[PDB]
Amino acid sequence: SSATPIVQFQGESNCLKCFRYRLNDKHRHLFDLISSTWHWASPKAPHKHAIVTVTYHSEEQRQQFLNVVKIPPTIRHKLGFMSMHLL
Amino acid sequence: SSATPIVQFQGESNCLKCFRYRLNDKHRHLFDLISSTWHWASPKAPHKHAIVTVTYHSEEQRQQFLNVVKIPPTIRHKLGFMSMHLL
DNA sequence: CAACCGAATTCGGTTG
DNA sequence: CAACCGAATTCGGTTG
């Protein structure tokens, strides 16, 4: 469909920073776009973590990425989709 | 569906900041979650703008929001969806 | 891996 | 409205 398959990363803001750096330096091919480290800005916040979005070409590149990549355990992730539209 | 109906805002980073502040101060009811001001971090960047995501309860609150809200013209937006999942 | 570097951005809020 | 406040966060990159 018009859903870009993506992975969201929550966790300490500095970790994600470097995780991003790690990803750009060694894994450019395994994903597509990587976001700066953001977070939810209102007091209506569901959590408190920092976040990095990472986008993918195919549900398959995503899945491939996941097998190769050793995500630090202080970092949790979720899978989802957003409109490609918005990249 | 588990698509959270959302609006993305591109534009100068400082504008969005205040726009966010404006939204929280006067419009808390018209939307749901508002993001900090992020941007796409790799050199593989589709653009250059800063971004704020804003999420919604219903496709209807979204649409309602849009009629009431006078978005500064230096600020462009897109409509989309992301997994609710991910908020 | 993340704590740390010093430099650069962004923060929330205020004001013209 | 966005430029400006000074303070606090985040940047990319370097290290142990």
Over chain B, what HEC string results? CCEEEEEEEEECHHHHHHHHHHHHHHCCCCCCCEECCECECCCCCCCCCEEEEEECCCHHHHHHHHHHCCCCCCCEEEEEEEEHHHC
What is the Cα–Cα distance from B35 to A38, expressed in whole angstroms?
7
Structure tokens at B81: 């969806």
For residue B50, what is the nearest residue in chain A, using CA coordinates?
A36
Query: How far, in Å, are A29, B31, B70, B72, B77 from residue B67 at the CA level?
Result: 42, 12, 8, 14, 14
Nearest protein residue, CA measured to C1' of C12: B21
Q: CATH number of the domain at A80, please.
A: 3.30.70.330
Structure tokens at A63: 């899945």
- Smallest CA–CA distance, residue A47 to chain B, in Å, is 8
In chain A, which residues from 57 to 86 place their CB closer than 7 Å to nucleic acid strand D?
none
Which method was used?
X-ray
Q: Which residues of A touch B82 (CB under 8 A)?
A: 80-83
Q: Which residues span the domain enclosing B67? A: 1-87
Q: Is A64 near chain B, with CB under 8 Å? A: no
Q: Is B48 near chain A, with CB under 8 Å? A: no
> How many other C-beta atoms lie within 10 A of the C-beta of residue B64?
16
Q: What is the resolution of this structure in A?
A: 3.2
> How many other C-beta atoms lie within 10 A of the C-beta of residue B84?
15
Q: How far is the CA of B15 from the C1' of D1 (A)?
A: 9
Q: Please name the amino acid found at residue B35.
A: S
Total domain count, chain B? 1
